[PDB]
RNA sequence: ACGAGAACUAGUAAUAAUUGUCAUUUGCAU
Protein backbone atom coordinates (compact mmCIF):
# COMPACT_ATOMS: atom_id res chain seq x y z
CA UNK A 1 0.00 0.00 0.00
CA UNK A 2 2.90 2.32 -1.00
CA UNK A 3 4.64 2.21 2.58
CA UNK A 4 7.30 4.64 1.43
CA UNK A 5 7.94 2.42 -1.61
CA UNK A 6 9.41 5.48 -3.59
CA UNK A 7 12.56 5.34 -0.61
CA UNK A 8 13.43 1.67 -1.15
CA UNK A 9 13.25 1.79 -4.85
CA UNK A 10 16.83 3.43 -4.59
CA UNK A 11 17.63 0.47 -2.26
CA UNK A 12 16.64 -2.37 -4.76
CA UNK A 13 18.59 -2.22 -7.90
CA UNK A 14 17.90 -4.82 -11.14
CA UNK A 15 20.82 -4.87 -13.78
CA UNK A 16 19.95 -4.68 -17.04
CA UNK A 17 19.75 -7.88 -19.18
CA UNK A 18 22.00 -10.07 -21.07
CA UNK A 19 21.51 -9.73 -24.93
CA UNK A 20 18.45 -11.44 -27.05
CA UNK A 21 19.64 -12.56 -30.07
CA UNK A 22 17.03 -12.56 -32.87
CA UNK A 23 15.75 -16.15 -33.10
CA UNK A 24 13.72 -15.57 -30.58
CA UNK A 25 11.85 -12.37 -32.02
CA UNK A 26 8.94 -12.17 -34.31
CA UNK A 27 5.78 -9.89 -34.87
CA UNK A 28 2.71 -10.07 -33.47
CA UNK A 29 -0.59 -7.99 -34.10
CA UNK A 30 -2.25 -6.17 -30.98
CA UNK A 31 -5.55 -8.42 -30.05
CA UNK A 32 -8.25 -6.44 -28.14
CA UNK A 33 -9.86 -9.17 -26.26
CA UNK A 34 -13.39 -8.04 -25.25
CA UNK A 35 -16.53 -10.41 -26.05
CA UNK A 36 -16.15 -10.23 -29.32
CA UNK A 37 -12.97 -10.32 -30.24
CA UNK A 38 -11.46 -7.33 -32.52
CA UNK A 39 -7.72 -6.73 -33.96
CA UNK A 40 -5.66 -3.43 -33.87
CA UNK A 41 -4.79 -1.95 -37.12
CA UNK A 42 -0.95 -2.54 -36.10
CA UNK A 43 1.19 -5.05 -34.78
CA UNK A 44 4.16 -5.32 -32.60
CA UNK A 45 7.18 -7.29 -32.71
CA UNK A 46 7.49 -9.37 -29.61
CA UNK A 47 9.76 -12.05 -27.80
CA UNK A 48 8.68 -15.50 -28.72
CA UNK A 49 7.46 -17.75 -26.55
C1' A B 1 92.38 96.63 1.01
C1' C B 2 85.80 91.52 4.05
C1' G B 3 89.68 86.01 10.37
C1' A B 4 90.27 86.31 4.28
C1' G B 5 91.72 83.12 0.13
C1' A B 6 92.24 77.66 -1.97
C1' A B 7 88.40 72.71 -0.56
C1' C B 8 82.88 67.42 -4.79
C1' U B 9 80.30 64.36 3.15
C1' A B 10 83.38 61.80 -1.32
C1' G B 11 84.91 55.75 -2.18
C1' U B 12 83.36 50.34 -1.53
C1' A B 13 79.03 47.32 -1.51
C1' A B 14 71.49 45.46 -2.80
C1' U B 15 66.41 43.13 -0.53
C1' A B 16 69.08 38.92 -0.75
C1' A B 17 68.63 33.13 1.08
C1' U B 18 65.07 28.09 1.66
C1' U B 19 60.19 27.81 1.17
C1' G B 20 54.32 23.23 -4.08
C1' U B 21 48.03 27.23 -3.51
C1' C B 22 48.17 22.36 -1.26
C1' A B 23 45.38 17.95 1.99
C1' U B 24 40.38 14.75 1.95
C1' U B 25 35.21 15.00 -0.37
C1' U B 26 30.39 9.97 -6.30
C1' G B 27 27.17 14.88 -11.14
C1' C B 28 24.24 12.29 -6.96
C1' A B 29 18.56 10.09 -5.15
C1' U B 30 12.84 8.36 -10.59
Redesign the pocket.
Known amino acids: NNEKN??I??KIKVSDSKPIDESNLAIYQKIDINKSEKSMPLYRECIDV
Open positions: KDYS
